[PDB]
């Protein structure tokens, strides 16, 4: 059962800008997704202090980076708080609308795309390198969902039948054909060292073959 939803105009506009603007410093997408993961990990950790049962779905708090050259995907996996269906369909949109408006304005106080994370919409920088983004997510007390969008003004949400995750979020970046450098081990290592050196959770870069 696949449901299809329209983005609000503001977010559709932001995604178009990110896809259509000439901007060479694309590597910042990874910093933004890892930062999101760290925030999600902070949240489940904090909640677990008052309710330890919230870690029954997995006690390990980490981030894995998984390149797959055959699929042409880079996946950012975390065991953070995860997202509910209401998050994916309603709440994200509400938050993202205001953040987009501010970011658009700031871009006309001369700001540059690399400051996107300060407006809470850093996720969408994924579209600097990805033609399609699939997000698999599992929050305690809700089902596992797959969100997906190739931009163009719509996204889908479905109940996910893949491998159960326990708790957390996987962001699967289906890379543009000219952005395959982000599947290379030394390139990913370079970016993590440069932008994400002090994240307070283990980041494991998986290797390939």
For the annotated binding site for ATP, the residues are 36, 78, 97, 123
Largest separation between any pair of C-alpha atoms in the chain = 47
Type and span of the H or E element at 200: none
For position 125 contacting ligand JR9 by CB under 6 A, the verdict is: no
Give residues 5-44 in contact with ligand JR9 (rule: CB under 6 A): 36-37, 40
Among 96, 129, 183, 191, binds ligand JR9 (CB under 6 A): 96
Q: How far is the CA of 77 from the CAs of 50, 65, 104, 110, in angstroms?
A: 25, 6, 29, 33
Q: Which is nearer to ligand JR9, 37 or 144 (CB)?
A: 37
DSSP of 13-54, one letter per residue? HHHHHHHHS--S-TTHHHHHHHHHHHHHHHHHHHHHHH-GGG
Which SS3 state, helix, strand or coil, does residue 165 take?
coil
Quote the least distance from Cβ 124 to ligand JR9, whole Å: 7
Q: How many residues at the interface with ligand JR9, by CB under 6 A? A: 18
Write down the least CB distance from residue 135 to ligand JR9, Å.
Answer: 4
Binding of residue 78 to ligand JR9 (CB under 6 A): yes
Residue, CB closest to ligand JR9: 40
The binder of ligand JR9 chosen from 28, 81, 130, 165 (CB under 6 A):
81
Distance set, CA 34 to CA 22, 28, 145, 152, 178 (Å)? 24, 10, 20, 25, 22
Q: Please, what is the minimum distance in Å from the beta carbon of residue 38 to ligand JR9?
A: 9
Q: How far is the CB of 188 from ligand JR9 (least distance, A)?
A: 18
* Strand 168-175 versus strand 73-78 pairing type: antiparallel
Residue closer to ligand JR9 (CB basis): 103 or 147: 147
The helix (H) or strand (E) run that includes residue 189 is helix 185-195
Binding positions for ligand JR9, rule: CB under 6 A:
36-37, 40, 78, 80-83, 87, 91-92, 95-96, 121, 123, 135, 147, 169
């Amino acid at each position: 059962e696949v449901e299809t939803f329209a983005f609000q105009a503001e977010i559709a506009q932001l995604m178009s800008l990110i896809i259509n603007t000439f901007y060479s410093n694309k590597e910042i997408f990874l910093r933004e997704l890892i930062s999101n993961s760290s925030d999600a990990l902070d949240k489940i950790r904090y909640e677990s202090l008052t309710d330890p049962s919230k870690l029954d779905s997995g006690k390990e708090l980490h981030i894995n980076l998984i390149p797959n050259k055959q699929d042409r995907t880079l996946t950012i996996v975390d065991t953070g708080i995860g997202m509910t269906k209401a998050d994916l369909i309603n709440n994200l949109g509400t938050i993202a609308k205001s953040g987009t408006k501010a970011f658009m304005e700031a871009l006309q106080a001369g700001a540059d795309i690399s400051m996107i994370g300060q407006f809470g919409v850093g996720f969408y920088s994924a579209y600097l390198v990805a033609e399609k983004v699939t997000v698999i997510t599992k929050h305690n007390d809700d089902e596992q969902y797959a969100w997906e969008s190739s931009a163009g003004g719509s996204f889908t949400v479905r109940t996910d039948t893949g491998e159960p995750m326990g708790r957390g979020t996987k962001v699967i970046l289906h890379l543009k054909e000219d952005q395959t450098e982000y599947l290379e081990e030394r390139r990913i290592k370079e970016i993590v060292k440069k932008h994400s050196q002090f994240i307070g959770y283990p980041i494991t870069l998986f290797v390939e073959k």
